[PDB]
Structure formats: structure tokens, C-alpha cells
Amino acid sequence: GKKVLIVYAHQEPKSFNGSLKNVAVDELSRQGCTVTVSDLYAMNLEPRATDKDITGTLSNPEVFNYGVETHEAYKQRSLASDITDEQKKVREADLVIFQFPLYWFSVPAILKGWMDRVLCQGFAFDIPGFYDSGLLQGKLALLSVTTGGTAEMYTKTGVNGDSRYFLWPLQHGTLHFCGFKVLAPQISFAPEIASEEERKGMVAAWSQRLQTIWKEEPIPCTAHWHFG
């Protein structure tokens, strides 16, 4: 009995992202998986890292250091309930899927805020306690990304460079850092300019992959994998 968390960052349910989220819920639900979706825009998730994220007495209330105070708050069980609720979902999940459109070679800010605020020290990593020793070891993560740019644009000789170049901060710097094993990304290139037929194929391809997702091995989340 596998538990999946989908962290979803799109404003419109009828979007191509909305369709990819829905196809994931349907397929994983049909398999008998336990599925939870954090729909960040519908939640109006707070993206800003502020002192409101700590509900206890600050370690140093004169000079506010977000990393220090959230770490201490996590240990004192005194983080904001929105953070606490996301952490519970992550803690229960065997797989965390991130579904989002690429914004400036990265995640939309609302999803960046999820990362910034949820993956706090003591919960997702410690020092020491990162990369292969990260605290979310034993979990899988998968980026399901849609782009404006075509696949040709995301090659070493295209204007945007290899897609693996933009994956590094997310897959390695964030997910691997917290101990996740990373499944190969699902990149759906340029749905806005693809044909109706081609769009259905990309949605179908995602649905089909998910049928066998539990038998995939993660990528080796290495510099070598990303950069050759």
C-alpha cells in the first residue's frame, strides 16, 4: 500500500498541468494507492519565509535568522500549522511528485516557497545529515515539468541548453540534499504550441509511465548524470 503526495502548482484546473495532475490522481487511485494533492494556489500557500513561521519564543528575537529559528522551532514543535501539515504529508509519502510549469528555469515562486518553508533543518536535513544521509532517505521524488520551450531548444546546442542544466538545483540541490532518491523527470515540452494530438500523447505517456512507476529505479543524482 503506497502513499503518494502530489505537490501541484498551477492556477487553472483545465490547464495542461491540471490534466497531468488529474491523470496522475486517476492512475494512482486506480492502482489502489493512497493519494494526496497539495494544490498550492487553491491553498493560497504562504511563500515568504518570515518570522510568522515560528509560533514559539525566538532563539534570538533581536536579530532574526530564518534558518536558525525554524530549525529550533522544528525541534520545539512550534512551526506554523501550514508547514506542520505539509511535513506530515511528506513524512507519510513514499513518492512525492511535483507537478508544475517551468518558470524562469525553475519552479513557480509558490512552489519555491513550499520548498523553502517545508524542508526545514531537523525535518528534511541536518548538518551533518544531507545528500545520501538526508532525513528523507527512503523516499522517492519526481519532477513533472511542463515548458514553453521545445525539446530542440533544450539541447546543448539550442538557445536554452540541456534540460539537465535546469534540473540540477531542484533534483540535486534540493531533493537529493534532503535524502530523496530521484526518479527520472517527466518533461512535457511545449504543450501550448503542440497539436491537440501531440498533447493527448504527452498526457497518455505520463499515464502509461505511472502504470509501472513502482518498478522504476531512481537516477544516480550525480554531477556526471547532469553534466557528463
Ligand X SMILES: Cc1cc2nc3c(=O)[nH]c(=O)nc-3n(C[C@H](O)[C@H](O)[C@H](O)COP(=O)(O)OP(=O)(O)OC[C@H]3O[C@@H](n4cnc5c(N)ncnc54)[C@H](O)[C@@H]3O)c2cc1C
Binding residues for a second copy, rule: CB under 8 A, are: 11-12, 14-15, 41, 44, 47-51, 62-67, 103-110, 112-113, 115-117, 119, 130-131, 148, 156, 159-162, 165-166, 168-170, 172-174, 177, 192, 223, 226-227
Q: For ligand C09, which residue of 11, 29, 50, 133 counts as binding (CB under 6 A)?
A: 29
Residue 75 binds ligand C09, judged by CB under 6 A: no
Residue 121 binds ligand C09, judged by CB under 6 A: yes
The residues near 177 (Cβ < 8 Å, ≥ 6 apart) are: 125, 130, 131, 134
Please list, residue by residue across 119-148, b when 16 or more beta carbons sit within 10 angstroms of its beta carbon and e when fewer do.
bbbbbbbeeeebeeebbbeebbbbbbbbbe
**Exposed, middle or buried by CB within 10 Å (0-12, 13-18, 19+), for 207?**
middle
Cα separation, 129 vs 13, whole angstroms: 38
Check the annotation: does 154 bind a ligand. Answer: yes
Alpha helix segments (H runs only) across 39-105:
40-43, 66-75, 81-92
Strand 34-39, strand 186-188: pairing:
unpaired
Block residue for cell numbers 548524470: 225
Q: Which residues bind ligand X (CB under 6 A)?
A: 10, 15-17, 19, 49, 65-67, 101-105, 116, 146-149, 173, 191-192, 196, 199-200, 203
Using the contact rule CB under 6 A, the part of the chain among 44-52, 132-140, 146-154, 197-205 near ligand C09 is 146-154
- Choose between 196 and 217: whose C-beta lies nearer to ligand X: 196
Three-state SS at 158: coil
Using the contact rule CB under 6 A, the part of the chain among 19-27, 41-49, 135-143, 164-172 near ligand C09 is 19-27
226 binding partner (options ligand X, ligand C09, Zn ion, none; Cβ < 5 to 8 Å by kind)? none
Binding site for FAD: which residues? 10, 16-19, 102-105, 146-149, 154, 192, 199
